[PDB]
Amino acid sequence: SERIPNNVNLNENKTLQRALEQWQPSFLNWWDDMGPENSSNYDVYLRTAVSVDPKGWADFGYVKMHDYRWGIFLAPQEGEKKITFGEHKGQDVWQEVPGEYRSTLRRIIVTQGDTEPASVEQQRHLGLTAPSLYDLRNLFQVNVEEGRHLWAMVYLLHAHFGRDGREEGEALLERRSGDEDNPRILTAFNEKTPDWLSFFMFTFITDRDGKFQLASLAESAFDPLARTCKFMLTEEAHHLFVGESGIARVIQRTCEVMKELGTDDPAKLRAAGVIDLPTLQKYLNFHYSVTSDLYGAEISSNAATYYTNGLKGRFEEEKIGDDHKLQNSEYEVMDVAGDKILTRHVPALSALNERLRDDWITDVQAGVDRWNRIPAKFGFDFRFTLPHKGFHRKIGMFADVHVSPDGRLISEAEWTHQHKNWLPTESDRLYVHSLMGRCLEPGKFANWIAAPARGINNQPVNFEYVRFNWSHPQFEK
Ligand SMILES: [Fe+3]
Ligand SMILES: [Fe+3]
Ligand SMILES: [O-]
């Protein structure tokens, strides 16, 4: 019923409500310019959140995405919640940011916010080559949710950061993925997402960085941010499912053709129009290593500071069996010293980036293990693996050297001769591009990917998840 749906009593804060209503047309102009291409008249079968009530939170129906009901939804407030780590452990959580942390928390929220529209901008062309209505609908669902995450951060900026907050909300729509004068902040969000295989890896791997960053902020002493991220985690889960099941369905299809043709010869697989498993492995290597750089330098005074001040906790902070202060704790990280990769212990507070990275690696591996059930049930030997964490890194201690996927420091000549086996080549990408082509007949799936296990919201897999309204009704006519 509400114009800006929310469970935050927005209408009782009239100054804030005015400011968000003032900002909304510019969000909608951004959505129209940079959102899913040519989609202004589509009716999409979308889920929309209307609460955080884990039973009846999200309801489905057709909507044109310009009319999507983007809302602000915080996890329920908890009475007498305490801060759980850092200097301030045991004190009451903050409803407003302490002045001394204000600009730091602001930059953290803006940086998180910036990735949300960035992903929409990267993915805006994908619809033209959607391999199915089911997949097109999933893409759009991810898009409108990422749009909501921008709302979720812009709300915090306006509600808790005054004028600076408003100015950040405006600049969040002035930056643009890949733009020369005003690029998005983070490299991985500034690059192209050129085809559906990249899109599925991105939502499987890079949205998972979102998951771990958000789980760290879900711990924050700044409780409105903590409550915001806590609810976004439940949405991020859907994104991770799109990416994991997306790739799982490509692997499934490729294995079907391997069994049918009785061969694992790449040339024969490609003649049949599937993506050979070794090439899938390269895309995994590419997105995994690129995403890894997002956690930042292994050793960081800044990250020590976020923890100590109560701004950002460790993943699942409350399950960790230590003092949650870490003045006298250690953490084991790698190091490179000439022609050797070694391990060393450093003060735990200085290595929080690396700890979060390690948590993400573990989570990604759990998903790859699930992928591996597929070749295994076909009786194939192929297994997907993650490359050594030092492989293909632009950030941190491995940035000045080459590491092979199996964890050796290698020479410039070996990198130059071998990396074509490890990362997608121009020729691999051209091949994958040649498979990309829309498939919009109900219940039909492009030949490079298998059908999903089930539909959406109990609908058949052949349901018309998107109705294009190809006819162009005339103004006032
Ligand atoms: Fe997001
Ligand atoms: Fe996401
Ligand atoms: O997300």
* CA-proximal residue: ligand 3, atom 1 (nearest): 236
463 C-alpha to ligand 1 centroid (Å): 27
405 C-alpha to ligand 3 centroid (Å): 28
Tokens found for residue 467: 């109705």
CB contact set of 454 (below 8 Å; sequence gap of 6+): 461
118 C-alpha to ligand 1 centroid (Å): 10
Which ligand gives the minimal distance to the CA of 149? Answer: 1
Beta bridge partners of 45: 62
CATH number (domain holding residue 397): 1.10.620.20
**Which structural domain range is residue 57 located in?**
1-477
Residue 78 φ/ψ, nearest 5 degrees: -110, 130
* Ligand 3 contacts CB of residue 239 (under 6 A): yes
Which ligand gives the minimal distance to the CA of 116? Answer: 1
* Ligand 3 contacts CB of residue 236 (under 6 A): yes
236 C-alpha to ligand 2 centroid (Å): 5
* Ligand 3 contacts CB of residue 208 (under 6 A): no
| Cα dist from 454 to 165, 184, 309, 461, 463, whole Å | 43, 36, 46, 6, 11
Q: What is the C-alpha separation between 35 and 39, in angstroms, rounded?
A: 8
Q: Centre a 10 Å sphere on the Cβ of residue 318 and count the other Cβ atoms it contains.
A: 10
DSSP 203: I
* Ligand 3 contacts CB of residue 210 (under 6 A): yes
Q: DSSP letters of 391-431?
A: TT-SSSTTTTSEE-TTS-EE-HHHHHHHGGGTS--HHHHHH
Helix (H, G, I), strand (E, B) or coil at 345: strand
473 C-alpha to ligand 3 centroid (Å): 35
Q: Centre a 10 Å sphere on the Cβ of residue 62 and count the other Cβ atoms it contains.
A: 13
Q: What is the C-alpha separation between 300 and 264, in angstroms, rounded?
A: 46
Q: How many residues does the structure list for the chain? A: 477
Q: How many domains does the chain have?
A: 1
Which ligand gives the minimal distance to the CA of 152? Answer: 1
Q: Resolution in angstroms for this experimental structure?
A: 2.1
Residue 251 φ/ψ, nearest 5 degrees: -60, -45
* Ligand 3 contacts CB of residue 207 (under 6 A): yes
Which ligand gives the minimal distance to the CA of 115? Answer: 1
Give the HSE-up count for residue 268: Cα atoms under 13 Å, Cβ half-sphere: 10
* Ligand 3 contacts CB of residue 149 (under 6 A): yes
9 C-alpha to ligand 1 centroid (Å): 23
178 C-alpha to ligand 1 centroid (Å): 18
Beta bridge partners of 82: 92
Q: What is the C-alpha separation between 186 and 199, in angstroms, rounded?
A: 17
